[PDB]
Amino acid sequence: ETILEQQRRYHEEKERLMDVMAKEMLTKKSTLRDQINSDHRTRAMQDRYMEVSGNLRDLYDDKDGLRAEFYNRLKQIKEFHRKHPNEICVPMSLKARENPSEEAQNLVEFTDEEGYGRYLDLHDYINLKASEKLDYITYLSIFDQLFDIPKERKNAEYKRYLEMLLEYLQDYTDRVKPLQDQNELFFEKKWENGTFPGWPKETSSALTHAGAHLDLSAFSSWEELASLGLDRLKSALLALGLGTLEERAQRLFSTKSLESLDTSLFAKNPKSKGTKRDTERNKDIAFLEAQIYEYVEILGEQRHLTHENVQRKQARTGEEREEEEEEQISESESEDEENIPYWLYKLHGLNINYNCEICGNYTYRGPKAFQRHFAEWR
Amino acid sequence: GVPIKVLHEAEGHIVTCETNTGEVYRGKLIEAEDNMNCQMSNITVTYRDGRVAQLEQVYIRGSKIRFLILPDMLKNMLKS
Amino acid sequence: GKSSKMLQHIDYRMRCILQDGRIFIGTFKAFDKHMNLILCDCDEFRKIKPKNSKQAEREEKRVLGLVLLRGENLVSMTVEGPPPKD
Amino acid sequence: AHPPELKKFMDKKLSLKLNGGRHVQGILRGFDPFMNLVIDECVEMQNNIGMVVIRGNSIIMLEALERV
Amino acid sequence: EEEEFNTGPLSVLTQSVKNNTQVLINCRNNKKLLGRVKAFDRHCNMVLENVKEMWTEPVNKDRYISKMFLRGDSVIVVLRNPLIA
Amino acid sequence: MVQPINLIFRYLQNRSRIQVWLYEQVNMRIEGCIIGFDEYMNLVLDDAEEIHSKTKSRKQLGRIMLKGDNITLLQSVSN
Amino acid sequence: SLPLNPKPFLNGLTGKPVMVKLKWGMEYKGYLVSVDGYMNMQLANTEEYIDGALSGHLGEVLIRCNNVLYIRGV
Amino acid sequence: MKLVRFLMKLSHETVTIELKNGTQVHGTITGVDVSMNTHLKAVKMTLKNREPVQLETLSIRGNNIRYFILPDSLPLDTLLVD
Amino acid sequence: HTIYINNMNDKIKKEELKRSLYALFSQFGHVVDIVALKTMKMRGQAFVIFKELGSSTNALRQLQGFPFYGKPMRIQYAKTDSDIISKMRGPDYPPNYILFLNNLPEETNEMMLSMLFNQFPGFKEVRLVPGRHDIAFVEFENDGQAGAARDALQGFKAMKITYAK
Amino acid sequence: VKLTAELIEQAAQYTNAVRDRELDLRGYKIPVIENLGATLDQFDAIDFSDNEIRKLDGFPLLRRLKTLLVNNNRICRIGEGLDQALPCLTELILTNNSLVELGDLDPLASLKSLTYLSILRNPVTNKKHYRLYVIYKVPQVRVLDFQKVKLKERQEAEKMFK
RNA sequence: GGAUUUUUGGAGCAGGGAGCCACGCAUCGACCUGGUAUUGCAGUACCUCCAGGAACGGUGC
């Protein structure tokens, strides 16, 4: 096998994919814009387009129609980028043949399926125009990633966690809204004004589950951003900074839950048996807490959006709440791309129950009619 | 029972069954009785040691079933 | 009187303990006379029920999915988390 | 007071898994609502024990050695 | 039914409640409960007073339980005696 | 079709010596001649024996009523 | 005998010395005072034989039905 | 007579229950039903060979109960009246 | 549809024999089932059942005398139809051992058809030789071998061979 | 005729003659092995006979796959991470394919459970020492080309190539 | 409304010792080397026999 051909086909496929996700970014600029905006608040350096472009949903001169679909295409582009990364990887890693090419001369076959099957394999399933999804990701379904209450990233469902929380505090004095008020705590509040004692079991377990949820939700709602990049960023921030909490009065706080006069005693405390014990037992929890913190910060807009939703639904009536639910439901299960003679009938013999077996086990109400079935189209 | 109706709904689907002894039987549910007696076909069985085997036809008594895994095709009885 | 003690926890995420000592966590959607249970998005745990075990919270976890458990083999249930909204 | 749906398995050779890690093989000759079975030409897994009664109580699983 | 509680094997329990006498209950848990029968039923559920629970672990052990309810399935044997005396 | 209860009724009439497999106990089985039985499969056995499969030892019992709880399986023996 | 059933057999054995084996391998010898519909059993002057050896002399005893393996007249 | 009826009266009592599997349960009864299925709150449950876990709520299948240890204060003679 | 194999090394355990048999014969078409016992009577033998008949004929001709676990296997068409085939599916001379017909020309010849017919121990009558070289009269000692030859070239891209029904 | 979940979903599924769950992928003219995820790891073995596959590669993690029938294809190369996606691969039938160099069979050394191997009707077969080379480089094989790997061959393959 | 498929139980109990490595007893099964018998058209508890090997597997105490 001549490597030249393989590497060629690779560069060609990469080109094909770039072209596909570029065509996408073209039809609906939001796809990139959306993504980029979020990226902006994670990696501050990122340069973002002119606001006007974002609003008018245009890339150069033409303003494109505003578009579940955005998210869909974002996950599709996600798998595309996965393919691309794979190919890039493998890639990083004459007369003799022309003679054997003479093999099997006599085949009556038309061969127009190398670039067409690929170009096609990655383009905007149906006969003509029913499903935006490419053949590449024809079995991609968002509803298996997002619940109905999340509305493809619009809201995050925290009712469940309100339940678990009630189970944690061993009472009922806590309302959904007071619970959200609790969540708001999450750079210093969640640490110095904790809902519960941060050494409580139930509490730490809860916090773990919740943290995990928030993180998965985050990356779920923003497929286009490099997950590994974000993860590593946060981890390094955790290791390198998080005596990051400093007070002019009490000094330096340690996530041992104690302060320290000066940096000196703080350092000579990070080798002590106490801190060794704690950092060796409560490491995973501390880290998870931190993640909950930063991921909730990155999702401030979604948190607010949901809290709002809560208050709304709460201030609804019965009919209102019902119709709203109807709406959320429809949004959830909708295609991502839209396209008298009484004795007369007895006398005449009609309205009498009868059945034809060969036709759909069909029912006929009259004998004259069924006798007319014998000559019919169906 | 409500769960029983949902079980009968899985007839004709591929299901997984663990017995009271922990043998794990996966295949097509042909018939499910009221008492949880289960007729299945074209089975893969995974014993407690990990080894697999293949069976054409089986029938397991309801009492000696620990649990069943049904498709997720059913999940969509929300009234109760 | 009320019959509610099971119906209350319906739709909630529930931690169920089996007679061999397994832990089944799923969404409690249905029960009956025998306490045969219907558990959506159900996973099985063996080693632990985590209360924030600093080493790890999860070992021998298995994704099962939609589970019907027979009541014969059920021991007990506690509330694990609130209902998922979906 | 239902019957087990076993008419399909009547007069077929079967493999019976019983409690205690016990296994026997034989031809189904009949049954009742408790799933008690009559098994003919039965063999303990191998030694021939003839026609026997298996109490449904102690029946874990059966497998047909034939096509039904 | 009362007749069957009165004269049948459960008369052991019927007699213990009436006379407020002690009985030793051999139990499935490999433990033995020694005390007085305040109430009982078909299943041999019981409400017991002044219960001395005894078992072994070899080391013998015991413990006092003033008031308790026993689910009757755990019953192996129930013994009446010159124990109360 | 032969019904299981009837098989027993046959065992009874025949006075065939019977060997019973017990529930969750493999090392011991019981033997005897069924004289009568009831709706719960409780059996009255004559000249009955405990059979130790491990020790090859037999314990002589005489008149036995075995609760049906223990019955796993019923077989006939020539002896 | 012409069909001798469980129930009559046990009733004939009331007033008699019996030994009951339990599923758990304990054995109890005594005079059968009575039995009931569920086959719960009442012994007097009971003795306990464990490993076939006299262990304890117990007196009057109720045995729950589910424990019983078999009963023998003796 | 039917002693489950007696147990059904013990809502809002705190008890210790020993299970068939050896587990020990201490909590406040919210409800006992006809199958002796028992429901509790503010529960400290100690599986055999663990340190306790605390649960806000726990629901026990009735058959899995060995026995209830009742409050010493409990006025049995009152509760046994129907 | 079923081929009968004999002269097999009977030291191979039954489940291994059947699995290698399945593997080896999968190259010609889907094998529906394999019947092989170790009784005195049946040891060293096996019945291999294929969904397609052309697959059975191809297998027979191509694996005749193939070294399997040390011995050269001998293959033949089975005497009767397999129970599984009869169930999946639902004249007195048939199966017949004389196949006469034509539609097999193209420089074809008598030593050609005589060697193709020769492949079979049933090689008895072979009539392919006039200017024709396209009329084939084949008398095969027995229908297992006539059926073997016929099943071997049962679609000589389409020739016409008609048993002397 | 790309391999597809849609293709895989309408494919004959059955319990084969050796009592294993098998998927029938035969005779579709598949050129590249891909999208196996959709089988959901539910098959003991897959029948890929009579297709146009060039390389035995592209498999997802499939823990239950124990038998691979790959007869009459165009296999000329074997992928390098096969054990990482097929840990219990026990039987591999490659009859009538295109493996030409002994070194191209090297990736099979990493399949720890591989016990039944068939490479007949491949040019590689006629290479000097082909059998001994396979035995030394893939010692986990017990039956090669339907013949028992014997001790004497193992020793002989230990001399040559030691 | 305690008698075989659920809620009045068939449960209960038994493992460390020796210097990371190795392990008592009983039963059953393939199983592995040699050698040897059979050439038989079937739908199957298993399937020749003879000698040697088991730092093999399962179950119970």
Contact yes or no for A144/H30 (Cβ under 8 A)? no
Q: Is the Cβ pair C82, A204 closer than 8 Å? A: no
Task: Give the tokens for residue A217.
Answer: 């939700």
Q: Name which of A84, A89, A106 is nearest A16 in CA terms.
A: A84
- CATH architecture of the region D7-64: Roll (2.30)
Q: Is the Cβ pair C75, H33 closer than 8 Å? A: no
* Chains touching I (3+ CB pairs < 8 Å): J
Contact yes or no for E53/E67 (Cβ under 8 A)? no
Q: Name which of D22, D19, D18 is nearest D47 in CA terms.
A: D22
Q: Is A269 helix (H, G, I), strand (E, B) or coil?
A: coil
Q: Name which of J19, J25, J22 is nearest J5 in CA terms.
A: J25
Task: Give the tokens for residue C34.
Answer: 């025998």
Q: Which residues of F touch G68 (CB under 8 A)?
A: 67, 69
Q: How far is B7 from chain C (nearest CA, A)?
A: 8
Q: Which nucleotide C1' is nearest D55 CA?
A: K4
Burial of residue H51 (number of CB atoms within 10 Å: 0-12, 13-18, 19+)? exposed
G60-G66-G68 Cα angle (round to 5): 60
CATH number of this structure's domain B1-80, picked from the four choices 3.40.50.360, 2.30.30.100, 1.10.3720.10, 3.40.50.1370: 2.30.30.100
Q: Which residue of A has its CA nearest to C49?
A: A205
Q: Which residues contact E52 (CB under 8 A, 6 or more apart)?
A: E33, E34, E35, E62, E63, E64, E65
Q: Which nucleotide C1' is nearest B36 CA?
A: K5
Q: Name which of I28, I84, I24, I87 is nearest I56 in CA terms.
A: I28
In angstroms, the CA of B48 and the C1' of K57 are apart by: 13
Report the protein residue whose CA lies nearest the C1' of nucleotide K4.
Answer: D57
- Determine the distance from the C-alpha atom of residue B75 to the mean position of all C-alpha atoms in its chain, rounded to a whole number: 16
* Cα A154 to Cα A68: distance, rounded to the nearest angstrom: 10
Give the count of beta carbons closer than 10 Å to the beta carbon of residue G31. 15
Domains of chain C, by residue range, sit at 1-86
Type of residue at A344: L
CA I76 vs CA A142, A181, C48, H13, I145: distances in Å: 57, 83, 62, 84, 7
* Cα C80 to Cα C44: distance, rounded to the nearest angstrom: 13
Domains of chain B, by residue range, sit at 1-80
The residue ranges of DSSP E strands in E6-58, in sequence order, are 22-27, 32-40, 46-56
Contact yes or no for I105/I97 (Cβ under 8 A)? no
Q: Which residues of A touch C86 (CB under 8 A)?
A: 147-150, 157
- DSSP strand pairing (F71-77 vs D47-54): antiparallel
Q: What is the number of domains present in chain H?
A: 1
Task: Give the tokens for residue A190.
Answer: 């969640």
* Cα A66 to Cα I19: distance, rounded to the nearest angstrom: 60
Q: Which residues of E touch H18 (CB under 8 A)?
A: 29
Q: Which residues of J touch I67 (CB under 8 A)?
A: 146-147
Three-class HEC string of chain I: CEEEEECCCCCCCHHHHHHHHHHHHHCCCCEEEEECCCCCCCCCCEEEEECCHHHHHHHHHHCCCCEECCEECEEEECCCCCHHHHHHHCCCCCCCCEEEEECCCCCCCHHHHHHHHHCCCCEEEEECCCCCCCEEEEEECCHHHHHHHHHHCCCCCCCCCEECC
Chains J vs F: touching, with 3+ CB pairs under 8 Å? no
Q: Which nucleotide C1' is nearest B47 CA?
A: K58
Residues of D (4-43) whose Cβ lies below 8 Å from F: 10, 18-22, 24, 29-32, 36-38, 42
Q: Is E14 helix (H, G, I), strand (E, B) or coil?
A: helix
Q: Which residue of F has its CA nearest to D11?
A: F1
- DSSP strand pairing (E22-27 vs D59-64): unpaired
Q: Of C21, C51, C78, which has the smallest distance from its Cβ to H57's Cβ?
A: C78
* Cα I157 to Cα I155: distance, rounded to the nearest angstrom: 6
Q: Name which of C74, I152, D12, F19 is nearest H59 in CA terms.
A: C74
Q: Which nucleotide C1' is nearest D46 CA?
A: K45
Q: Which residues of H touch C73 (CB under 8 A)?
A: none
For residue J37, the enclosing domain spans: 1-162
Residues in a beta bridge with D41: none
Q: How far is E83 from chain H (nearest CA, A)?
A: 23
Task: Give the tokens for residue D63.
Answer: 């497998």
Query: Does residue B70 belong to the interface with chain D, where contact is any CB pair within 8 Å?
Result: no
Experimental method, per PDB record:
cryo-EM
Task: Give the tokens for residue H79.
Answer: 């509760």
Q: Which residues of H touch A202 (CB under 8 A)?
A: 54
In angstroms, the CA of D41 and the C1' of K46 are apart by: 16
Type of residue at I25: F
Q: Which residues of I touch J47 (CB under 8 A)?
A: 26, 30
Q: Which nucleotide C1' is nearest I13 CA?
A: K30
Domains in chain G, please, with CATH?
2-74 (2.30.30.100)
Contact yes or no for J91/J47 (Cβ under 8 A)? no
Q: Of J14, J18, J21, which has the smallest distance from its Cβ to B44's Cβ?
A: J21
Cis peptide before I95 (omega within 30 of 0): yes
Contact yes or no for I22/J16 (Cβ under 8 A)? yes
* Cα E77 to Cα G23: distance, rounded to the nearest angstrom: 13
Type of residue at D3: P
* Cα B22 to Cα D60: distance, rounded to the nearest angstrom: 11
Q: Which residues of A touch C83 (CB under 8 A)?
A: 159-160, 163
Q: Which residues contact I27 (CB under 8 A, 6 or more apart)?
A: J49, J71, J72, J93, J95, J96
Q: Name which of I164, D19, D7, I22 is nearest B23 in CA terms.
A: D19
Q: Is the Cβ pair A167, C79 closer than 8 Å? A: yes
Chains E vs A: touching, with 3+ CB pairs under 8 Å? no
Q: Name which of G46, G38, G44 is nearest G67 in CA terms.
A: G38
Task: Give the tokens for residue A147.
Answer: 């619940």
CA E10 vs CA A43, A345, G40: distances in Å: 80, 76, 8
In angstroms, the CA of J162 and the C1' of K3 are apart by: 73
CATH number of this structure's domain E1-85, picked from the four choices 3.40.50.2300, 3.30.1360.70, 3.90.1150.10, 2.30.30.100: 2.30.30.100
- Positive/negative CA dihedral, H21, H24, H27, H32: positive
Give the count of beta carbons closer than 10 Å to the beta carbon of residue E8. 21
* Chains touching J (3+ CB pairs < 8 Å): A, B, I
CATH of the domain at J104: 3.80.10.10
* Cα A329 to Cα A327: distance, rounded to the nearest angstrom: 5
- DSSP strand pairing (E75-80 vs G53-63): antiparallel
* Cα J95 to Cα J98: distance, rounded to the nearest angstrom: 9
Q: Name which of A28, C38, J38, A22 is nearest B74 in CA terms.
A: C38
Q: Which residue of J has its CA nearest to B14?
A: J42
Residues in a beta bridge with D30: D38
Q: Which residues of H touch A169 (CB under 8 A)?
A: 56
Domains of chain E, by residue range, sit at 1-85
Give the count of beta carbons closer than 10 Å to the beta carbon of residue H42. 16
**Tokens 């010159």 sit on residue:** E82
Resolution of this model in Å is: 5.1
Residues in a beta bridge with D37: D31, D54
Report the protein residue whose CA lies nearest the C1' of nucleotide K58.
Answer: B49
Chains C vs H: touching, with 3+ CB pairs under 8 Å? yes
Q: How far is J53 from chain A (nearest CA, A)?
A: 14
* Chains touching E (3+ CB pairs < 8 Å): G, H
* Chains touching B (3+ CB pairs < 8 Å): C, D, J
Residues of G (1-40) whose Cβ lies below 8 Å from F: 1, 3-10, 13, 23, 39
Buried b (16+ CB within 10 A) or exposed e, A10-22: beebbebbeebbe
* Cα C38 to Cα C31: distance, rounded to the nearest angstrom: 6
Nucleotides of K under 7 A from a protein CB: 1-13, 26, 30-34, 36-48, 57-60
Q: How many CA atoms lie within 13 A of A176 on its CB side?
A: 15
Residues after which chain G is broken (C–N above 2.5 A) are none
Domains in chain F, please, with CATH?
3-77 (2.30.30.100)
Instruction: Give φ, ψ of E27 to 5 degrees.
Output: -130, 150
Residues of J (109-128) whose Cβ lies below 8 Å from A: none
For residue I31, the enclosing domain spans: 1-90
Q: Is A132 helix (H, G, I), strand (E, B) or coil?
A: coil
Q: How far is J72 from chain I (nearest CA, A)?
A: 7
Q: Which residue of E has its CA nearest to G45?
A: E81
Q: Suggest the residue from D6, D9, D37, D60 to mutate for an interface test with chain B (most B CBs closer than 10 A).
A: D60
In angstroms, the CA of D46 and the C1' of K28 are apart by: 9
Query: Does residue A163 belong to the interface with chain H, where contact is any CB pair within 8 Å?
Result: no
Query: Does residue G8 belong to the interface with chain E, where contact is any CB pair within 8 Å?
Result: no
Q: What is the number of domains present in chain J?
A: 1
Contact yes or no for I7/I1 (Cβ under 8 A)? no
Contact yes or no for C27/C39 (Cβ under 8 A)? yes
Q: Is A234 helix (H, G, I), strand (E, B) or coil?
A: helix
Query: Does residue A280 belong to the interface with chain C, where contact is any CB pair within 8 Å?
Result: yes
Q: Suggest the residue from J94, J114, J145, J146 to mutate for an interface test with chain I (most I CBs closer than 10 A).
A: J146
Query: Does residue E4 belong to the interface with chain G, where contact is any CB pair within 8 Å?
Result: yes
Q: Of A166, A170, A201, which has the smallest distance from its Cβ to H42's Cβ?
A: A170
The residue ranges of DSSP E strands in G1-74, in sequence order, are 17-22, 27-35, 41-50, 53-63, 68-73
Contact yes or no for D10/D36 (Cβ under 8 A)? no
J113-J114-J117 Cα angle (round to 5): 165
Task: Give the tokens for residue A176.
Answer: 């959904």
